[PDB]
């Protein structure tokens, strides 16, 4: 795996960000995590949805460097979204959300599972500390 540079365009939700990558706008979905959501007229807004969305927004808007890391399987999903691990100044946004109790580890589909072990470790700790969703 290798990290490549990208530029923020806009944060959309806890689990989705729009970036300029290789000179083109794309929507990215964060690999291996599921955050409560604010969109959708499904349930509309779920508990901890606004919080997860603000967490992601502040972490990417305040970064001096954004990097994307593709896994070793497919790189886009059926909606055209990029599938990746996103780093802000060297820290993985995906892991940060799970460590804070603002995401659960979710949808693990081989072979895009390279950091699965590491994120399950972070999720166990957040549950143990009874944070946010696990409160």
From Swiss-Prot:
It is found in: Secreted. It comes from the Bacteria. Transmembrane segments: none annotated. The active site is at residues 29, 37, 81. Residues 115-131 have a biased composition (Basic and acidic residues). Coiled coil: none annotated. Residues 115-135 are annotated as: Disordered. Ca(2+) binds at residues 15, 34-35. This is Nuclease A. It comes from Staphylococcus aureus. The gene is nuc. The chain holds residues 89 to 223 of 231 of the full protein.
């Amino acid at each position: 795996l290798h990290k490549e540079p990208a530029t923020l365009i806009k944060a959309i939700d806890g689990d989705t960000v729009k970036l300029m990558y290789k000179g083109q706008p794309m929507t990215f979905r964060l690999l291996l995590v599921d955050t409560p959501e604010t969109k959708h007229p499904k349930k509309g807004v779920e508990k901890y949805g606004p919080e997860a969305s603000a967490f992601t927004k502040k972490m990417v808007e305040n970064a001096k460097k954004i990097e994307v890391e593709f896994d070793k399987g497919q790189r886009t999903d059926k909606y055209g979204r990029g599938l990746a691990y996103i780093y802000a100044d060297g820290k993985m946004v995906n892991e940060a959300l799970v460590r804070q109790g603002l995401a659960k580890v979710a949808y693990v589909y081989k072979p895009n599972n390279c950091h699965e072990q590491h994120l399950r470790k972070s999720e166990a700790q957040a549950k143990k500390e009874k944070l946010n969703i696990w409160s």
